[PDB]
């Protein structure tokens, strides 16, 4: 059945159309040196409103890939959003859907903070501490990638995890910019990813275009590391299933587990059939996701969760254990094997 369902979904002669009357903003590569400034003036000043930081990160992505490539990416993502270009005025940027009041506020706040830290201090600002640093857009996109790995999770868990992991992953940027509010920027990125779902596809295309590069700075290598940490998002049950098989859990040989193993292997075969893009299904909110669910094998899922709980892997996972006796037996065996 599962192969037939995927065959129906894949073999479609008709293309969906959505967001027909909508538009979005991009910034041409000719403005990259400008957007960098903006992407850094968000980082070293303490701003009251961090509402469009995610849009500025996506603007930098658009400068990197190019306006035409970004339009093509949005078009092949199933969304008929018409790209609107970015202009300059007196210079500053007039990004579509980003209020000019916001851009002026961010610029003025950063200029005032820079003046205050230059007047009082000894005037020895290093090359990495200024807003026009060239890795500041990647530093913002690193907060974006941290909150990207938690798009399958909830908002509160995502924000808490983003802040906790960014105090260590982004320690160097925090030292360079003492006053960068990872919570508010992470909230902005979560809002962008939820509202504009095609920007998930744009962000993934940037991740690919960055990982495929021949050279990169440490910021881009960090961004790619986090982006790849997001790969199996929304499918931790499959990873824990292969973990359970590697652990040689005895309760995998139970009668009901052996009964469901056929369709479990069917799900894994479907994973292989989709191939490399299967991992990005839940990150993209591809409607085709959910063909990879193991919820139709309650006993296998309970055994997998029990094995994870025994090994300590389960952590604070919020999934359901359908069959509690199998869960407890598997947990006991996994603890025994671990000890």
- Residue 150 as a binder of RNA (CB under 7 A): the answer is yes
Binding residue for RNA (CB under 7 A) from 197, 245, 319, 335? Answer: 319
Give least dist CB 307 to a copy of itself, A.
9
Binding of a copy of itself at residue 246 (CB under 8 A)?
yes
Q: Does 317 bind RNA (CB under 7 A)?
A: yes
CA separation for the pair 266, 3 (Å, rounded): 8
Start-end of H helices in the chain: 2-10, 32-41, 53-65, 67-76, 100-119, 136-148, 155-169, 171-176, 182-195, 198-211, 218-229, 236-247, 255-274, 298-311, 324-338
CA dihedral (216, 217, 219, 222) positive or negative:
positive
CB of 11 to RNA, least distance (A): 22
Which among 85-93, 125-133, 147-155, 327-335 is the span making contact with RNA, rule CB under 7 A?
147-155
Subset of residues 161 to 180 that bind RNA, contact rule: CB under 7 A: 161, 164-166, 168-169, 172
Q: Which of residues 218-247 bind RNA (CB under 7 A)?
A: 218, 221-222, 224-226, 229-230, 234-237, 239-240
CB of 320 to RNA, least distance (A): 6
Q: Is 153 in the site for RNA (CB under 7 A)?
A: yes
| 318: contact with a copy of itself by CB under 8 A | no
Q: Which does 277 bind (CB under 5 to 8 A by kind): RNA, a copy of itself, none?
A: a copy of itself
Q: Largest alpha-carbon pair distance within the chain?
A: 75
CA-only gyration radius of the chain, Å: 23
Answer whether 307's CB lies under 8 Å from 331's CB.
yes
Residues of this chain, 265-294, that bind a copy of itself according to CB under 8 A: 275-280, 284-291, 293
Phi, psi dihedrals of residue 225, rounded to the nearest 5°: -60, -45
From a copy of itself, RNA, none, interface partner of 156 (C-beta below 5 to 8 A by class): none
**How far apart are CB 258 and RNA at their closest, in Å?**
18
**Binders in 104-123 for a copy of itself, by CB under 8 A:** none
3-state secondary structure of 83: strand
Q: Which listed range, 66-74, 125-133, 142-150, 183-191, lies at the site for RNA (CB under 7 A)?
A: 142-150
The nearest distance, CB 9 to a copy of itself, in angstroms, is 5
Q: Does 44 bind a copy of itself (CB under 8 A)?
A: no
Q: Is residue 155 a contact residue for a copy of itself (CB under 8 A)? A: no
What 3-state DSSP class applies to 25? strand
Residue 77's alpha-carbon distances to 130, 164, 202, 203, in angstroms, are 37, 32, 9, 12
Within 205-244, the residues that bind a copy of itself by CB under 8 A are: 208-217, 220-221, 224-225, 228, 231-232, 239, 242-243
The neighbour count for residue 223, using CB atoms within 10 Å, is 25
Q: Any residues with CB less than 8 A from the CB of 336 and at least 6 apart, and which? A: 310
Look up residue 258 and give its two tokens: 């052996």
Under the binding rule (CB under 7 A), the answer on residue 289 touching RNA is yes
Q: Give CA–CA dist 223/12, Å, rounded.
A: 35
């Amino acid at each position: 059945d599962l192969s037939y369902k995927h065959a129906i979904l894949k073999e479609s002669q008709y293309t969906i159309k959505r967001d027909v009357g909508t538009t979005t903003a991009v910034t041409p590569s000719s403005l990259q040196q400008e957007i960098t400034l903006l992407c850094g003036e968000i980082l070293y000043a303490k701003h009251a409103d961090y509402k469009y930081a995610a849009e500025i990160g996506i603007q930098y992505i658009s400068t990197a890939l190019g306006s035409e490539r970004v339009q093509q990416i949005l078009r092949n993502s199933g969304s008929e959003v018409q790209v609107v270009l970015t202009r300059t005025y007196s210079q500053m940027l007039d990004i579509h859907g980003v209020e000019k009041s916001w851009v002026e506020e961010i610029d003025k706040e950063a200029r005032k903070t820079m003046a205050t830290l230059l007047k009082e201090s000894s005037g020895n600002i290093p090359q990495n501490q200024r807003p026009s640093a060239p890795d500041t857009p990647i530093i913002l996109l690193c907060v974006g990638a941290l909150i990207f790995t938690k798009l399958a999770s909830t908002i509160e868990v995502g924000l808490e995890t983003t802040v906790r992991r960014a105090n260590r992953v982004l320690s160097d940027a925090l030292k360079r910019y003492p006053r960068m509010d990872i919570p508010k920027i992470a909230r902005s990125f979560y809002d962008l990813f939820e509202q504009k779902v095609y920007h998930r596809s744009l962000f993934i295309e940037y991740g690919k275009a960055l990982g495929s590069s021949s050279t990169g700075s440490k910021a881009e290598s960090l961004f790619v590391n986090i982006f790849m940490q997001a790969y199996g998002a929304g499918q931790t049950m499959l990873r824990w299933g292969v973990i359970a098989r590697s652990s040689n859990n005895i309760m995998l040989g139970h009668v009901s587990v052996q009964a469901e193993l056929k369709q479990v292997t069917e799900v894994y075969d479907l994973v292989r059939e989709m191939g490399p893009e299967s991992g990005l299904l839940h990150l993209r909110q591809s409607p085709k996701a959910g063909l990879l669910s193991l919820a139709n094998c309650p006993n296998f899922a309970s055994v997998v969760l029990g094995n994870a709980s025994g090994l300590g892997i389960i952590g604070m996972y919020r999934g359901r254990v359908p069959n509690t006796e199998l869960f407890s037996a598997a947990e006991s065996y996994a603890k025994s094997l671990k000890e």
